[PDB]
Design a protein around this motif. Structure first.
Motif, mmCIF file in Angstrom:
data_model
loop_
_atom_site.group_PDB
_atom_site.id
_atom_site.type_symbol
_atom_site.label_atom_id
_atom_site.label_comp_id
_atom_site.label_asym_id
_atom_site.label_seq_id
_atom_site.Cartn_x
_atom_site.Cartn_y
_atom_site.Cartn_z
ATOM 1 N N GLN A 1 -22.068 -32.658 12.343
ATOM 2 C CA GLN A 1 -21.906 -33.767 13.326
ATOM 3 C C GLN A 1 -20.614 -34.444 13.077
ATOM 4 O O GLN A 1 -19.741 -34.818 13.884
ATOM 5 N N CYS A 2 -20.525 -35.155 11.636
ATOM 6 C CA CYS A 2 -19.364 -35.910 11.319
ATOM 7 C C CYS A 2 -18.202 -34.997 11.177
ATOM 8 O O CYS A 2 -17.212 -35.760 11.228
ATOM 9 N N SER B 272 -15.818 -41.069 16.451
ATOM 10 C CA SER B 272 -17.033 -41.886 15.682
ATOM 11 C C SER B 272 -18.438 -41.755 16.825
ATOM 12 O O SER B 272 -18.089 -41.241 17.729
ATOM 13 N N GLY B 273 -19.628 -42.368 16.343
ATOM 14 C CA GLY B 273 -20.710 -42.368 17.055
ATOM 15 C C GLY B 273 -21.858 -41.020 16.279
ATOM 16 O O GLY B 273 -21.151 -40.245 15.665
ATOM 17 N N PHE B 274 -22.922 -41.336 16.759
ATOM 18 C CA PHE B 274 -24.015 -40.198 15.725
ATOM 19 C C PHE B 274 -25.011 -40.534 17.008
ATOM 20 O O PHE B 274 -25.773 -41.087 17.243
ATOM 21 N N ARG B 275 -25.226 -39.184 17.359
ATOM 22 C CA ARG B 275 -26.361 -38.734 18.354
ATOM 23 C C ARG B 275 -26.995 -37.969 17.706
ATOM 24 O O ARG B 275 -26.901 -37.102 17.220
#
Ligand SMILES: *[C@H](O)[C@H](C[C@@H]1CCNC1=O)NC(=O)[C@@H]1C[C@H](C)CN1C(=O)[C@@H](NC(=O)OC(C)(C)C)C(C)C
Ligand SMILES: *[C@H](O)[C@H](C[C@@H]1CCNC1=O)NC(=O)[C@@H]1C[C@H](C)CN1C(=O)[C@@H](NC(=O)OC(C)(C)C)C(C)C
Ligand SMILES: [Cl-]
Ligand SMILES: [Cl-]
Ligand code: NA
Ligand code: NA
Ligand code: NA
Lengths: 301, 306
Positions: free
Chosen positions: B299-300, B1-4
């Motif tokens: 990205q995901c 997870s995370g989103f940059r």
């Protein structure tokens, strides 16, 4: 002018990324000279990830239990050793794209670029900071382990992070390239939690100086503060203490802008007290803490 | 997870960057096969920039007036020609690091990665959006001209931007690789300004989906709206219209999360009308509009490049 979250160009690192498979687990390795570095948990099985005895597990591995692939080429593993939480696979071919490089262990507050990779292939590049609680706020999915963080000031790649795991809050933990974890974490599935995080005060100040360089003045004020009164206030907002080292490193930016460090600290105190009242600073409605003083000088000058 | 905010890996482009010098001006060029591309304003003195006559200035130039350097290797210029606002320098050597590439022109709202260069040397990479007013909010200093923007699909680099100038508000203007400016800008020393900008609605929606995927759900509500009704609200807040094609493009994210686009639009309507009440979304206190739907999915899902 302008100010962006800017990563280092990733090509020197892209040429080092390989795929490592052991058993049913695939992740990424870093191929430098004739050694491939990867997280040692690639050798754990599903029947014992809680208390793996890595020394006992590794001695049972043959070189041919490791499948290493560089693009379309299988690399032959000829030896293996463990250094802390990193596995070093000796291969029969040196990487002809090995850059000038070094390994550096960084301190909290330092920033670096991450080249996120899957199956030995790069997905994207972004900027991170080592948080005060020794996690990083990354973007990592299953298979991302072995992706690295790095800086390239001048022409030498400084590798500072290798990715190993995701904690329950959605943040990330890993090691330096000597295999030592940042923070108290361990490569076991035993219960672990990040400590309460805090804001990297010196970096916020650096970013306020970047905003002044880029033309912002609205948050400046006529006040100053003592260093100790600043820290007494800042800590009430879960900001890290500002040390005299930090004051010193902000000297150049203070000279360039004509705003004394403790004068800017009084600006930060006021921003914490008041908020931004519908305004923004460098395109953010929050105070940004993942630019260092060195980052600001590099990007602005 | 995370989103940059994530850029494409820049390796394939780094191998194409060279230094171009004409007179006392140095900037960057893009070396592909046996041609180096760079901004045509490299041929101008401060004089000429006032009201440049580019084709007259160029015939006056010879091949030897252009110094091109790949690292510390000089490349011999053997011809030159103009294409719109880009200069094409034919060199005697094909770039052995030329990737699979094409030249594309992007639309407002689309994102791309910028490889900021100085003196032919790559310095940094970051992700941008072509704004509705056809500027980009870049980070560029003296010597950055000729830096390029790009996307990657599988193993093909699509070059879409070359940097030419900074406008008075500190935002940036440039061309596609065929030398056509984005926006109503000219490479002339005359008064010019960014127009009023708007927010890229479909991208805000994509980022709200990214938030939901990453566990950030406080802004969800039971309500839905119509495309018609929502676009009246968008207009009021200087948001771009949402089209049925935008709705269709978001379909995969709607299916994944269970939040239909017009359901999410009802969230966005309330956020615009009421604010965030002191909360944040994916670590931001503003509504972010420089992620496209494709960026979120890539990205995901961990897409990589070969
Ligand atoms: C390696 O590719 C992988 C990267 C992870 C997957 C999801 N996002 C990432 O960053 N890392 C792991 O799968 C490691 C291996 C380790 C034995 C478990 N692990 C985890 O990241 C797991 N965390 C975990 O177990 O956390 C504690 C229970 C130790 C707190 C997660 C997959 C849950
Ligand atoms: C090329 O390296 C350079 C990149 C600029 C320098 C500062 N930041 C950048 O993005 N481009 C230029 O210097 C071009 C060439 C042209 C002759 C002037 N110019 C500008 O960007 C200037 N803008 C300008 O004159 O704007 C108008 C008045 C035409 C609107 C700025 C340097 C002021
Ligand atoms: Cl309803
Ligand atoms: Cl923000
Ligand atoms: Na070390
Ligand atoms: Na002050
Ligand atoms: Na809703």
């Amino acid at each position: 002018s302008g100010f962006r979250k800017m990563a280092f160009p990733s090509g020197k690192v892209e040429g080092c990324m390989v795929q490592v498979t052991c058993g049913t687990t695939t992740l990424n390795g870093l191929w430098l000279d004739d050694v491939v570095y990867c997280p040692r948990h690639v050798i754990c099985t599903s029947e014992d990830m809680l208390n793996p005895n890595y020394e006992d597990l590794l001695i049972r591995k043959s070189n041919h239990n490791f499948l290493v692939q560089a693009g379309n080429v299988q690399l032959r593993v000829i030896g293996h050793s463990m250094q802390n939480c990193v596995l070093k696979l000796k291969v029969d071919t040196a990487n002809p794209k090995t850059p000038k490089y070094k390994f550096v262990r960084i301190q909290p507050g330092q920033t670096f670029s991450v080249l996120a990779c899957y199956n030995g292939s790069p997905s994207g590049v972004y900027q991170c900071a080592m948080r005060p609680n020794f996690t990083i706020k990354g973007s990592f999915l299953n298979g991302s382990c072995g992706s690295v963080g790095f800086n390239i000031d001048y022409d030498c790649v400084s590798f500072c992070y290798m990715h190993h795991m995701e904690l329950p809050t959605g943040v990330h933990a890993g090691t330096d390239l000597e295999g030592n974890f940042y923070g108290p974490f361990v490569d076991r599935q035993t219960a672990q939690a990040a400590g309460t995080d805090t804001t990297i005060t010196v970096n916020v100040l650096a970013w306020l100086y970047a905003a002044v360089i880029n033309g912002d003045r609205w948050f400046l004020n006529r006040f100053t503060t003592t260093l100790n009164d600043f820290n007494l206030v800042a800590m009430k907002y879960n900001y890290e203490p500002l040390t005299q080292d930090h004051v010193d490193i902000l000297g150049p930016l203070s000279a360039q802008t004509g705003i004394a460090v403790l004068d800017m600290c009084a600006s930060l105190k006021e921003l914490l007290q008041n908020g931004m009242n519908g305004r923004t600073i460098l395109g953010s409605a929050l105070l940004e803490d993942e630019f260092t003083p060195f980052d600001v000088v590099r990007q602005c000058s």
